[PDB]
Design an enzyme around this catalytic site. Structure first.
Site, short mmCIF file in Angstrom:
data_model
loop_
_atom_site.label_atom_id
_atom_site.label_comp_id
_atom_site.label_asym_id
_atom_site.label_seq_id
_atom_site.Cartn_x
_atom_site.Cartn_y
_atom_site.Cartn_z
N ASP A 1 0.81 -1.24 0.00
CA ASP A 1 0.00 0.00 0.00
C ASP A 1 0.85 1.30 0.00
OD1 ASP A 1 -2.24 -1.76 -0.03
OD2 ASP A 1 -3.31 -0.82 1.62
N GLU B 1 -5.93 10.46 3.41
CA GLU B 1 -6.34 11.55 4.31
C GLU B 1 -5.39 12.73 4.27
OE1 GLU B 1 -3.30 9.66 5.79
OE2 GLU B 1 -5.03 8.46 6.41
N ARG C 1 -9.96 23.17 19.96
CA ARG C 1 -8.64 23.12 20.56
C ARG C 1 -8.35 21.65 20.89
NH1 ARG C 1 -5.44 27.18 24.78
NH2 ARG C 1 -3.69 25.75 25.10
N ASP D 1 -5.23 18.26 19.68
CA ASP D 1 -4.01 17.85 18.97
C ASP D 1 -4.06 18.14 17.47
OD1 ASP D 1 -2.89 17.01 21.30
OD2 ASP D 1 -2.70 14.94 20.88
N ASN E 1 -8.01 7.40 10.21
CA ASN E 1 -9.42 7.63 10.54
C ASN E 1 -10.02 6.61 11.53
OD1 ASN E 1 -12.23 8.83 9.65
ND2 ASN E 1 -12.43 6.60 9.51
N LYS E 2 -9.74 5.33 11.32
CA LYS E 2 -10.27 4.27 12.19
C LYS E 2 -9.74 4.39 13.65
CE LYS E 2 -10.89 -0.77 12.68
NZ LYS E 2 -10.45 -0.77 14.10
#
Lengths: 259, 258, 257, 262
Positions: free
Chosen positions: A45, A119, A144, A146, A160-161
């Site tokens: 990948d 992403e 606000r 990370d 995402n997961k």
């Protein structure tokens, strides 16, 4: 058809690549990496993603195929079935299918543009990360925490997961916004939930004080100084796969995560 | 056009109804609650849900308009804008719906249900254990409190409370969500919410106990001898009469962030 | 020591009990199920829970021991094949008492009081509840329900609700939400809340006064409830332990392997 | 009593400092930076954290109090307008010293660190993979963004953002949370936050990369060729000068739920 092959760089991939090229030579099939009609990615990948970014201007245009070896989500072929793939490509029994992509725009004080297959993430460079989130020109929240992550549907199985995102079948025309470690107090109230936006919707991150950000599109992180705005929308461009059977997506998800 | 108006039953809802009805007297719009062209709902999303279910055989015939005596997620009208709404009484915009099919092990036929929000499944008492089957392939064995399949427009309600993604209601999908799963040596679930396209089928199959509490929107029926519960995006859609583009994300902000 | 044994009633557990009873006959130990000093549970946490609830007026005076066949879980430290070692070790008195905190629930309408080993839940059956902490309004919750867990109970339902797993020696109780709507009108904290001793959490209906209250085990439909009150019990459960209880490895053996 | 004062450094706080120092001159109260008995912080939890760390070699002999010059956070129980009233009470000594537990972090390449809030571990840039060993026994193999070990008083901060439980600061414990763990039938983790008592040690052991971004409260350093990171509840505590019950859950309400009067 015109075709080309990328390999990870190790022994196995490089050998497979030369063997497949040799097998295509027997057919009405020409190697051509300037204007290919098929791209074959061998390795994994990471090498697939590199091939995708190698051909962003010709996506229209190209049908991608992946080989590698737990198939993951950008491959449906193993090295012990490459010969069967040469023949099927050969002539020519597929099957084009398209996934949505994500466009990132960074404005300063000249606009920069990026296409993601998986992403795009934003973080603080310096101290606190604080950003106004504006949806379709209308203020949604002052975040606000990370960082934020905007994912394609194919990207939903990756970063995402981990962040509490929904896993989406890759055919669905959307992008999905997840929070990284939001403070969520009464000053910086946020939604908490992952957000899924259709085509034509634009999400805009507007700095409140500090204007420096680490932006990373798929692989590559870049530091952007004096950012006025970051913009997210579903891209007009799509990525195409050459499919020889129905891609068993939910089965792959099972095999990857369940086991 | 033929029309009818439903109300929450409280003081204000009934007054606004009689008002609008007197407002439709001056024009060529006859009251009919058997086969109407417009259904107008006054009183919020619970009320709107009832009107949708009141007329689910004529969904292809009807445009719905919601008035919230306030707004919610299925009303873009406040009960003082009513006068300007009567005058205007459009583009017909469609939301996707959820088909639920319950198949039985006895000489009883399948029962089908349409949901605007969600369908949920829980046990009737003891532990809830179900095999999840996607496009005829075993995906997981789930143990937990229950499961929730949401429509895109249903994602702002129960689905949201469960960790689901909020989706713009135009997106052709259904989202599966977990209620208090168990993960241990024995049971392994995906954990994450799952979003399916049209044409995909998620099938729930009993492992030990064939009795289920199945909810469809407001209504929860105890179902017996269940052999399978099936979910898919319905071929049917609900139609809203839109006089202006609906500001969905602004409405999420107002309900949840304000 | 006076002692008693409960098995779950299957043959294997029934006959281990009988053979433990005979093994104890060879020592100074007397079978007494009215005022035992040692309660032995053979067969599982369901059996251990029932034993705990049978003897809650003498938790003061009892040390518990669990025996179990599979993965021992959190309320047993012995398997059948070790039963003969336990008989001897118990009888020579070679153990240390170790205690876990408990949860007191008070239900007001008249007043009903309940002890939990694991947890206590509140569900409706439109569940709106005012959550008041140490007599101060904290939040107005609307959702499926609420869960108050003991430290030992944190591996059960508390865990499925997103709660922290806590070592069972910490004197605390943990409140978790089930499906809070968490909007403008009904703002909630989201996070699990861990309370020390002497803190009190009070749930007060705003509309409907009927609730399904559970205490471990037993789900009760309480009628016309004005208040449900939680606090760490003054009472504790005592175990007779013959070595260091390996809690974190049991978490691993239940959840990871 | 000997005292000193730290300010955030805006005019508001810098002037309050000088007003209080002058006020304390009406009493037998000696300004001393090296050996204070009362540290007063002016300007928020960030300012309080810096003060703590300035005097972490003398925690047993100091009582801390905070004034928060914007609102108040979780470490300041006083508003700037109550400064003069605070000057008197301190001069009388009408206060109970209440202590909170701390977290000790040990890094072996041994360097040790005290935290009032948390300590976190992230990787340089590559994947973050670590074996998690509890009380000498392997518990899980974590792969993800990071791990965070919080103190009880630190649960309202980063710990909370990560899905951690909020704990009353009196509770003698530390809490471990996951940052974006991968769960894929190769890297199975517990998921749940874990709450450890005193004397329990959590050990993070590197797998195939020995370089970590380690944070302790505000401070964040790149440690190279790490063999182990150890966490445990410290034997050292921080002491607050309390004049009245600290209403912790009300401060949680004010910060996270709503504050309808302010």
């Amino acid at each position: 058809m015109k075709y080309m092959i990328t390999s990870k760089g190790d022994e196995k991939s490089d050998l497979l690549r030369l063997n497949m090229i040799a097998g295509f030579g027997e057919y009405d099939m020409e190697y051509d990496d300037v204007e290919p009609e098929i791209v074959i990615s061998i390795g994994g990948d990471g090498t697939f993603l590199s091939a995708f970014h190698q051909y962003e201007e010709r996506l229209d245009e190209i049908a991608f195929i992946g080989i590698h070896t737990h198939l993951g989500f950008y491959a449906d072929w193993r090295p012990a079935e490459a010969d069967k793939l040469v023949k099927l490509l050969a002539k020519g029994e597929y099957q084009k299918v398209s996934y949505p992509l994500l466009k990132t725009t960074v404005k300063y004080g000249k606009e920069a543009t990026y296409l993601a297959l998986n992403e795009s993430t934003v973080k603080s460079s310096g101290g606190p990360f604080v950003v106004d989130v504006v949806i379709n020109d209308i203020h949604f929240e002052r975040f606000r925490g990370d960082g934020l992550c905007m994912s394609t549907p194919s990207g939903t199985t990756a970063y995402n997961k981990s962040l509490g995102g929904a896993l989406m079948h890759p055919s669905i025309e959307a992008m999905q916004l997840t929070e990284m470690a939001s403070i969520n107090n009464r000053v910086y109230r946020t939604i908490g939930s992952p957000l899924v936006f259709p085509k034509h919707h634009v999400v805009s991150l507007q700095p409140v004080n500090d204007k420096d950000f680490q932006i990373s599109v798929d692989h590559l992180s870049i530091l952007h100084r004096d950012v006025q705005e970051i913009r997210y929308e579903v891209s007009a461009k799509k990525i195409h796969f050459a499919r020889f059977r129905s891609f068993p997506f939910w089965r792959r998800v099972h095999d990857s995560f369940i086991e």
